[PDB]
């Protein structure tokens, strides 16, 4: 509880479809982007945390809640764009006479700040008297001991909770989701999604000299001008699809009804025909 682990993963493919065929996870409340539509979404920095709590305390893992474990043991900020996964672990985390291998903090002066782990254990002296490493009436121990017995109903049984801190900051992603690796595109317009970056335009080859550390490529603005192939390392510029304006040449409805269209910005290829300047 107070020593929740953190095993961050990076540079790997995360297929969340495996979690469905596992043990029943009737706690999949994705406080974030989307519970189902998650495989078609890459991540940059995913932090996987884990801890074991009771049953009636799982509702405090949501971003923003009161209680005892959501204020002094493990508190989440009101910006968490991720998912929480919990399941009944009363089959292997609850033994005879109670499993005392889980300790939770009970006495803490101030509220726990976002993403803080209190691994220290000092004698909680609640003021008004100088205490020492002993136990008395006004001086007690901050950490407590959980009693996980199989004779408890829904609410007092152990529940292994594991969350995924999806940062998703603007940066070259490392943890992409599972998707069918399709082929390349010729001088046509597509909806490519190269390494998280989801743009649209003509993917034509270029003659730029990218550096070994460079992945993306921009221009005088924030537009992704060029990019390198993830599995080919080729410099291909990303030019947007052909667009323009439409001007209707009308000689007047009182005279006739024939019109003429002026596709300004086209070379008579992406549309008699007469190319003007």
């Amino acid at each position, epitope marked *: 509880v107070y020593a929740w682990n953190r095993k961050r993963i990076s540079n790997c493919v995360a297929d969340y479809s495996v979690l469905y065929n596992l043990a029943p996870f009737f706690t999949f409340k994705c406080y974030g982007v989307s519970p189902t539509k998650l495989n078609d979404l890459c991540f940059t920095n995913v932090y996987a945390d884990s801890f074991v709590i009771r049953g009636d305390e799982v509702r405090q893992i949501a971003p923003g809640q009161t209680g005892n474990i959501a204020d002094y043991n493990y508190k989440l900020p009101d910006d968490f764009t991720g998912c929480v996964i919990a399941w009944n672990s*009363n*089959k*292997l985390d609850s033994k005879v006479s109670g499993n005392y291998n889980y300790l939770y903090r009970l006495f803490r002066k101030s509220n726990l700040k976002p993403f803080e782990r209190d691994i220290s254990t000092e004698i909680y002296q609640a003021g008004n008297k100088p205490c020492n490493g002993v136990a008395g009436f006004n001086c007690y121990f901050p950490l407590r001991s959980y009693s996980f*017995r*199989p004779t408890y109903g829904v609410g007092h049984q152990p529940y292994r909770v594991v969350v995924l801190s999806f940062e998703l900051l603007h940066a070259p992603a490392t943890v992409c989701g599972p998707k069918k690796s399709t082929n390349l595109v010729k001088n046509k317009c597509v909806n490519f999604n190269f390494n998280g970056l989801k743009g649209t335009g003509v993917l034509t080859e270029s003659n730029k000299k990218f550096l070994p550390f460079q992945q993306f490529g921009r221009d005088i603005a924030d537009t992704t001008d060029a990019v390198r192939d993830p599995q080919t390392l080729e410099i291909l510029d990303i030019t947007p699809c052909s667009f323009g304006g439409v001007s209707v040449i009308t000689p007047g409805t009182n005279t006739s009804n024939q019109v003429a269209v002026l596709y300004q910005g086209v070379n008579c290829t992406e549309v008699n025909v007469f190319q003007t300047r």
Partner: antibody
Amino acid sequence: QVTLRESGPTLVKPKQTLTLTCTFSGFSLSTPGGGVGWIRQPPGKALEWLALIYWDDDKRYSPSLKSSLTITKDTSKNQVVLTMTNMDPVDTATYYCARLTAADTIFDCWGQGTLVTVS
Amino acid sequence: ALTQPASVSGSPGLSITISCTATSSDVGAYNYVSWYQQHPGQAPKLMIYDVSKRPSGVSNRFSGSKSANTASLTISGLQAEDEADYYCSSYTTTSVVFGGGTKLTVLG
């Protein structure tokens, strides 16, 4: 598969310390949720649990008998040994050691039976 | 603990039920309950655990349920090779109870 065999002296003097063992083979005791226990079955009576060990050196015993039941694990040679003192001529029964795979599967695989008469 | 009927009789072909009562049931919700079968001279083998399901290797003759707090073992199609003792077992607050005994005597 799981083979739970017992051994030890069947006939013993009264008021002594039993050394009934349980040699398990076919699985590892270090699995999360595993453990080997002991169940007594008197002739013409019902079952009764005596002791149970786990994968974290925890030794759980019956609340009625705690001053004599002393179980120990020997995974180094895969032989669970049970020791009990103050043997009275009422404990004569066929003992069984079964593996507790998990909480839902309470002692799926059992032993074979060793009658330990106390007279 | 758990109390079970001492003597239960059953005609060959009919079906009989057992009673696994509360008897100061400190088990709580009584979620997990397993039934065993022990023939005279052999070791007790698991017949049905988690009465909502059945283990592999057991025919459909054995089935169980628990209405409110009492587990029942419904054994249909009695045969000569069925006279054995059955036990219901659960998890108590400080031990693992195995209940009482139930001897089946198939007459005829």
